[PDB]
Amino acid sequence: LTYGMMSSNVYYYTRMMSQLFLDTPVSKTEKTNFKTLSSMEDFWKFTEGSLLDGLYWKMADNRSFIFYENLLLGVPRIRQLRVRNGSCSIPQDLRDEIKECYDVYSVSSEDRAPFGPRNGTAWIYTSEKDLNGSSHWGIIATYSGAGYYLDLSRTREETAAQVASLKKNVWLDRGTRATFIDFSVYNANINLFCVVRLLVEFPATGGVIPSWQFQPLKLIRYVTTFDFFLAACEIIFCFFIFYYVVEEILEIRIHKLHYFRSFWNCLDVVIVVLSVVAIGINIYRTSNVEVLLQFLEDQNTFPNFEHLAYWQIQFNNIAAVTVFFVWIKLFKFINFNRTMSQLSTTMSRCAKDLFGFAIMFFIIFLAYAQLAYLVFGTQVDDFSTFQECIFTQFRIILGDINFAEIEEANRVLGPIYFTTFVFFMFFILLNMFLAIINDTYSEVKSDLAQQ
């Protein structure tokens, strides 16, 4: 099932699109692309430049095939989020020097009033329910499904005019906090949709943070015989999950009411829970392809394939974790001789001590991480958040770090932090694990040999 989903190379399908849109310079002279936007004018150059060139291709207002093979479905939509003027608190000592203020994005601070030339739907707030959207969770904050949206056209000559009119009558003020672009393509040669979303966030402190998301989907599954084979395998997998559920339930009913101090029963229940969650997600995402039908009734509309891509991603994550744990369960049967038996016994008997030492190891790890966060957090760019500090420390363990950047931030307490971390991690902490492992291994081997 899983490797049928991971079929022949769709990596090149994704790579062509990402290279076409992200890496194309916004214009002939400038070297700026979507991955390196730095201001609002860069975004306006990108919208009128590489975006229209990468969207609409030539051969009466016929369809555009992106690589002569990928068909642009319907029209793309552009949508923004705003905040209200005077939505913060400014000190009374400067209320004559500072006039306007816009807070960071929050659902309680977002603008909901018409602005500018209040004629169309780009200058009027539309609710999340009326837009059929949902929250996105960008890099800075979790944005809403509502906002000020505009539906573009099917040809270059009209989308260019629409964007030019949006740019003249200023559409991106200082209150803007995000901007989305969405579209989808088909590529009938294989049976696979692609859903693209381009997000640009404008933080309250200034700047631009671009992000992107390219997801391939298959919504017309039953076409070839291999698809029927995959459907049969799906049914077989559901039958296996039912059998495992009923077996574990009957074995937890009376016999061994505790049932949890084995680590194989725990693995079984983890696998069962992940599998039933995956089955439920699959059932409640495939049974709802009604957006595809709505699009097929009239193909001059915006295809709303965002929730489908989101749930596809969730299903992929659950399936990957389930495959990992099912493969890990293979250790239950490799006991065919004494060499594997003693190694498994060694691991089982050393887990109880390695957990006790790993508590201390992780306490010291977190102490170092929090010190790095508090000292270098505002300067290095690798310690901006606690999770980034943990990732940076794990990378330092590999030697994938740039000591120059962390030395420049603080000439003292930078070298001390780095040197002490490396020394104590490699000279002390990495060797107590070896001491415990070797002691337990020698003890169990000698005990078995003696007995």
Binding site: E97, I98, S106, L374, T419, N431, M432, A435, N438
Partner: protein, 767 residues
């Protein structure tokens, strides 16, 4: 009321709840330990003869004890059994194992036990004069009475009935002071008291947060929170009503399986506290914290006295004593941990916004285009291009004051970083030195008392220098810059330029101190330095901000540790060396004192500079760089203190019996690791010298063998080495340490630690 539609996080409530839960868990575990220890077993006492054969006729199974109703010890009578087991016409003469200790005062009581027939013999007392503390007397009434009637004495009137009752029950049901004063086998398990106290503190905080966050419009509508100065009017009547409204519900449980129904209450209370208490501004949060603290103090001093009116034996005793000492140490240390967490983590969203703001400011000033320069005359077009439009354009709505530009003359202009002497101090007129009427038109502008020492590359400056106001509007600024350009301002002497203005950002509430400085080693050469320090302008006059409370608590902890350690240090006198011990305590007190002193200095400097700026806005500079540096130093000291406390928390994990081997192994293997460290340092120094001497001799044609084995600090390749200004030591240390790591050479610690651990484990379970 359903406030806070926003999804912001107030770390104060969650941090306090987490600390309280962890304290409850560890106290419950240690109290279960004490519970089973006490159940496994269940100086006033003398060691002399207690033979009282002056009477007879009371032959019966009798075994009673004594009650040392004195100070520091309140225990009742006990029981014992000898060989004869109190046979007929026999008086027992023995001693009891009572750990209660009395003093040299009239505080003694003895009980009697007459099961069956009434007593007829007269047992005066135990004949003892001076054995341990002489807390007994060989004289008593020795008069017969009714059954179970103990004769009173010293060394029914109500004025003597309830007075003695306030000594056996005063330390019995004093809920706060009862965990370490529990009499033997009291049916409360010594953990339901912990459960009830954690329940009530949780309720106190939760109710205070609910009142401050939800019910705050009925009485004081339109901004109930408006007071922060402590004048015995705020946060003093706040916790009292909460305690009054949640104390009867405490009495419902105090009078069972109430722990199972109370854990749900704890969970819902902390959930509500995290729900309503999340939208607290700094004043509201500190007011809530102080109200909860005042409620706890009032309950401990006002409500506790209200309801009270209505031989291995020495080894076990010292075990109990050290267990109580450990409990007291746990409570004080966890309070210190909570204080230091509140001192450190109060500006997390501030911290993230600070990073993003400094990055945005750097990219808007063309940091790459300013640092990567090699032509000293393109700076004027640079500033006329990317500095003046930045300052005066509509892009920068918040400015907070005009810029400034001060240069040092040094008065011995160099002939074309070395060859430097003193600095100029005199005044010069328009152009250069020309005093006609009074002082120079370009005055010295003497350095300020506070705020200096930029500490550049090859020099350390101060706040003095000939300043330039650069005007206010764009038109006059260009005239001033051309005036300075073609009027011999920077032409001749050119020590430094020191360009600095300010930055404000009302959306995130942070200021930023931006500094541009050029050092001129020789004429026709220049190097540039960029630093951007964002900070929050919190003032001392603002009231009772969280930094002030945390700092005063930290100072109290510092003085507490100082006196508690100096008490032992002075007893030992001299020769208190060869251990970490007192030196580690000095390090701890130094850190926890510097953290508070730097924070107070930062608050005072911020207040003074803000007042100075408010004096005249478009008139001066006000130099917030001192405030930024003090903020950074306080943050670093708080981080170091939290690091030390977390390391101590990791160390204190040894009390699990099977996990005590790691610390002992490290401590015992320390000398061998020190020897190997010395050997590794020697080898690394040799390697570093070899590497430098091989690499600093030519370009790309160094050699073939060495560069296949040559290890450098990660992030820097083999191309760009040997900086022609200073041979820095930290990169060399990195190279030595990483070459030591990569060639193995750090796994000999494994060789030593394996032997030490295997030796230690063989002496722990085998005997």
């Amino acid at each position: 009321v359903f406030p806070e539609p926003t999804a912001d996080v107030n770390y104060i409530v969650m941090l306090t709840c987490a600390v309280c839960l962890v304290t409850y868990m560890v106290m419950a575990a240690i109290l279960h330990k004490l519970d089973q220890l006490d159940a496994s077993r269940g100086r006033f006492k003398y060691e002399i003869l207690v033979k009282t054969g002056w009477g007879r006729g009371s032959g019966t199974t009798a075994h009673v004890g004594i009650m040392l109703y004195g100070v520091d010890s309140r225990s009742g009578h006990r029981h014992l059994d000898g060989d004869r087991a109190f046979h007929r016409n026999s008086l027992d003469i023995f001693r009891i194992a009572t750990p209660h200790s009395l003093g040299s005062v009239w505080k003694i009581r003895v009980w009697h036990d007459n099961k069956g027939l009434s007593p007829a013999w007269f047992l005066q007392h135990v004949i003892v004069r001076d054995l341990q503390t002489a807390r007994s007397a060989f004289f008593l009434v020795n008069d017969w009475l009714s059954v179970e009637t103990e004769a009173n004495g010293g060394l029914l009137r109500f004025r003597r009935l309830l007075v003695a009752e306030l000594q056996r029950g005063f330390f019995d049901k004093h809920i706060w002071l009862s965990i370490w004063d529990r009499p033997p086998r009291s049916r409360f398990t010594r953990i339901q008291r912990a459960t009830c106290c954690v329940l009530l503190i949780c309720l106190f905080l939760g109710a205070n947060a609910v009142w401050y966050g939800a019910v705050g419009d009925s009485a004081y509508s339109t901004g109930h929170v408006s007071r922060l100065s402590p004048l015995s009017v705020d946060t003093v009547a706040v916790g009292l009503v909460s305690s009054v409204v949640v104390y009867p519900v405490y009495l419902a449980i105090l009078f069972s399986l109430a722990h199972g129904l109370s854990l749900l209450l704890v969970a819902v209370a902390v959930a509500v506290s995290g729900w309503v208490g999340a939208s607290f501004p700094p004043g509201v949060s500190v007011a809530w914290l102080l109200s909860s603290s005042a409620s706890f103090l009032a309950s401990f001093l006002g409500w506790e006295p209200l309801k009270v009116l209505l031989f291995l034996a020495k080894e076990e005793a010292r075990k109990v004593k050290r267990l109580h000492g450990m409990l007291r140490s746990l409570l004080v240390y966890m309070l210190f941990l909570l204080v230091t967490l509140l001192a450190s983590y109060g500006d997390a969203s501030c911290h993230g916004h600070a990073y993003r703001l400094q990055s945005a400011i750097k990219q808007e000033l063309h940091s790459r285009a300013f640092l990567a320069i090699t032509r000293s005359e393109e700076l004027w077009p640079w500033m006329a291009h990317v500095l003046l439009p930045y300052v005066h354009g509509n892009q920068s709505s918040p400015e907070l004051g005009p810029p400034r530009l001060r240069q040092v003359r040094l008065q011995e202009a160099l002939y074309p970083c070395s060859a430097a002497g003193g600095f100029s101090t005199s005044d010069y007129d328009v152009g250069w030195e020309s005093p006609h009427n009074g002082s120079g038109t370009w005055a010295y502008s003497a350095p300020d008392l506070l705020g200096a020492w930029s500490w550049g590359s090859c020099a350390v400056y101060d706040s003095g220098g000939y300043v330039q106001e650069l005007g206010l509007s764009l038109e006059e600024s260009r005239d001033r810059l051309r005036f300075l350009q073609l009027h011999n301002w920077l032409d001749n002497r050119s020590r430094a330029v020191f360009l600095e203005l300010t930055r404000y950002s009302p959306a995130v509430g942070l200021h930023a101190a931006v500094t541009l400085r050029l050092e001129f080693p020789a004429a026709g050469r220049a190097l540039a330095a960029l630093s951007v320090r964002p900070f929050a302008l919190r003032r001392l006059s603002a009231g009772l901000s969280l930094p002030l409370l945390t700092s005063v608590c930290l100072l109290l902890f510092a003085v507490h540790f100082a006196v508690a350690e100096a008490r032992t240090w002075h007893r030992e006198g001299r020769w208190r060396v060869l251990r970490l011990g007192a030196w580690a305590r000095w390090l701890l007190v130094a850190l926890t004192a510097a953290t508070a002193l730097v924070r107070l200095a930062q608050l005072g400097a911020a207040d003074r500079q803000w007042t100075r700026f408010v004096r005249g806005r478009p008139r001066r500079f006000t130099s917030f760089d001192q405030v930024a540096q003090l903020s950074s130093a306080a943050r670093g000291l708080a981080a170091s203190l939290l690091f030390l406390l977390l390391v101590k928390a990791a160390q204190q994990l040894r009390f699990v019996r099977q996990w005590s081997v790691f610390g002992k192994t490290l401590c015992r293997a320390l000398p061998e690791l020190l020897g190997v460290t010395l050997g590794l340092v020697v080898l690394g120094v040799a390697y570093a010298q070899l590497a430098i001497l091989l690499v600093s001799s030519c370009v790309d044609s160094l050699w073939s063998v060495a560069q296949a084995l040559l290890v450098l600090c990660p992030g820097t390749g083999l191309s760009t080495l040997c900086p022609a200004e200073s041979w820095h030591l930290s990169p060399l240390l990195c190279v030595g340490l990483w070459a030591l790591r990569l060639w193995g050479a750090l796994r000999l610690g494994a060789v030593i630690l394996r032997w030490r651990y295997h030796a230690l484990r063989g002496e722990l379970y085998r005997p």
